[PDB]
Amino acid sequence: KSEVAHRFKDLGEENFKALVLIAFAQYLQQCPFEDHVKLVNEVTEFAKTCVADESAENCDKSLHTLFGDKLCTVATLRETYGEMADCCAKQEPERNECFLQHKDDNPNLPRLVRPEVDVMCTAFHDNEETFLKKYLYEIARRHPYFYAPELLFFAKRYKAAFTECCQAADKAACLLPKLDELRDEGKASSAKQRLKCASLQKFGERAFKAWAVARLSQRFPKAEFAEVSKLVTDLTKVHTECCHGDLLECADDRADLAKYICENQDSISSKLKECCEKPLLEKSHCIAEVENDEMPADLPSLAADFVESKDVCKNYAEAKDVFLGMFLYEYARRHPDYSVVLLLRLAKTYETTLEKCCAAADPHECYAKVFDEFKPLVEEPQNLIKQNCELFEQLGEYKFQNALLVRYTKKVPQVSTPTLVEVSRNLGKVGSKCCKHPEAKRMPCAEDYLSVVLNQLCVLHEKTPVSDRVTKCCTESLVNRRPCFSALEVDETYVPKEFNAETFTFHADICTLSEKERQIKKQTALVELVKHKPKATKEQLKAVMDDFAAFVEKCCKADDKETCFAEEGKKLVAA
Template structure:
């Protein structure tokens, strides 16, 4: 799994939600901007993605009808920008066309959205999305020869259907990410269809594309969950972490929400902002932004002003004048000065700083109080470092499989209400995070970023998601400190497990006959049952002892049939 940053998906969030608009008046000077040209050129894909994510049950035939309508709409507006219908935002136009499709709103429970407007309508569509896609049929698979024949017959039709199938199963992934996935898969199909061993080629070359999608899906679901539970202020703090990568970028540009303008600004001032983004600025949308976000960090700048936030005599007055801007600037400066820290840790520091000022500004000597803020920052970071250090020690001791089972135990104890599949998936992602990060020089930031995303998946997107009181408290109380909160969770002893049956550990022959990934899945399902068996039957076994039992179980498959 590639180490990605929170700013990756914040970039895409603003790109799609705020930049994807038609001009509000015919003479809009930005009408032929690179962004608008990109939208025009990709209107079919954008329509497919939006519709498939809004109405996941919709058929591909429904999608094709809407695509045809939206292409005609775009063509009319390009030909005559003064038409009344062309003053609508594309998203509004698309939603209205969905409402106009005969019987579709009633069939797919969208009728209640039809009477809403603006933000309420967008929210209504958003909450219609379903994170659990088990209701959809399995992803359609074709024999490699059939796949390549369909690709050669009509590359456009083949890719449109691929985008539709991926989008409806990933309703919270931002459109630019899915466009990138489609482009990458097109390259894979083009190359593999010329190979003799097509199946092997697809299996090898498609794996990184799937991993790319999984990684971004995790990040983007997390940011959606953060927004729904904690509002825009959390996103604002994430957005300010551009300064981690482009430490010379001036503070004022960080306040610009239209990401296309941010990218234009950065690329127009490469010399003063960064020496490492020239190739990125030569790329097209959205590759330009993704490239900039993933570029190497600049050298530490000389104009750091972090000290002013602990040494100034007038901090309380400055804070009270414009609190939002004041704390945003603090986060910006602290990020530039501490590029080794993770985004969650920077959010923790910002939260600690708010608390410090809140307490100190009530005392008789505020400056004497808040000058000790750095001690609080160091205490917080030291605690976070110790958590990561302990996690990587587990990885070094037990390896990837052992760590997976260790977290499967912990998660099962703290959140036994989750399904088998979800617990296994979360355990696997925890293990993947440690396997990815625990050998890197930037171990702390990498682990803290990725593990926090796993917790984001556990907490889910819906603000009303409930698991149990302790887990809900960690998920909903404080976004910055949920990692510390989860670290202190104990087992949920109020949970009443399902009744165990005598055939719980009856091993059928198919366990030995299963291969590779299928075999691993079957074994994981058995291992999942062990925490219930030992913990809920009150056996006094430590996590480490259970982990040892799970590791031994790894060798069960080969031995059963011997």
């Protein structure tokens, strides 16, 4: 009856406050921290009165009306430059649609640099409650599409490392190796969910369902099609709600789905035994990455049910959604060595062929050779991941990253330098992640990872579009994004970039760089070099790059660093 009371009773006061805090920080990523907590406390205050009596006033209002009204009380900024939506001047459901609108994927915010080790322990034992909420606020506003129930699981692992290393002799040896892991998997998890949200909002519900049908069929190849279909239906509702700002409903229905899977293991998978004995947050996280089950032994051939049968065109006419879903389910459950986007490519080819052949004379003869068309679609990814692992093994991660950085800069040189650097580094991480697997698990690992990193490129670029060819590859076909970018060649409509020199101004931090920060500086410099001389050969690029690095060398060792960079730098500009 009263929706705010229902969610308060299902989740408990702990997770209720955390989810509402995450919700407000993703809609207003600019807002001060202490200003958010004040709004979260008035929520919890009013929800308790509705639990006491559901006919108390305003208790019959929707969550969108309650959350939307609180956010509209304070959130003023400054200059608009004549262009800025007024979500608070709109009614529901238009107002919420205006909030999801203003989610910023790349916002200016001070780069969180850890204070020293001994003061975080002072701040944990400060106001513990206030310390944990700063962890959620600071990451939610930087990742406004972060999977909400999974962020609660990281807040618990974050609290566990503080209650185990602050009470030790040596702290930094206990902590820091546990904080850097939490922010690595934290950033893997964020980009993963961004691809799901991007699918739902930009390609529709039917595209996401087909994606989850293929993936759950690989994980649970012994389950019946009716069992896979119910799982997909529940899973789509969950991600639709998280991706639309209904975080209370999203967490609630996710606990329901885990409870359903654990009490039906004997018709789903035999690998859910250990995950189902874990506590709640641990549980859904364990199911999220359980491994593939054993494939059934003597499954019948695919060509019997989809090529040779006389009822092919009949079944496709009388029930196309069930028939085409059946094709995808049967093909994926026996090809765990295929990537998801490859499997979706095959089903797309199968449906196009049927629409043509079933409208002609003798359809049985028309589509009889449809597996011939799958052969080229399968070999292209296999050979591509073949050569990158060879290059990775030979070069190493940093040199592998630089090789990908150069050719992507040559494909889309209009893309900004910060975006090109971060994307190229993430592309190069696939070698470390996948090339160590046998030559069978590689493509499931690799191609589905590249889809995540390329989606990052798409959403970073659409905010400020500059490259016509990026816009093309991003908006045409979701499942064809990776073959789209790989087929791009060097762009010759691009005019060489002017030299600027402001990129190389001296800073006191360049002579005490960590190994990681040193690589980022050189990659940035390499991008700007390719943009300025797009026809420079790769032998000429090394000579110029080696010369500049040696210039940075000695000057970091001179009597006056800042005079060396100014004096010697002027000679290089006028050379």
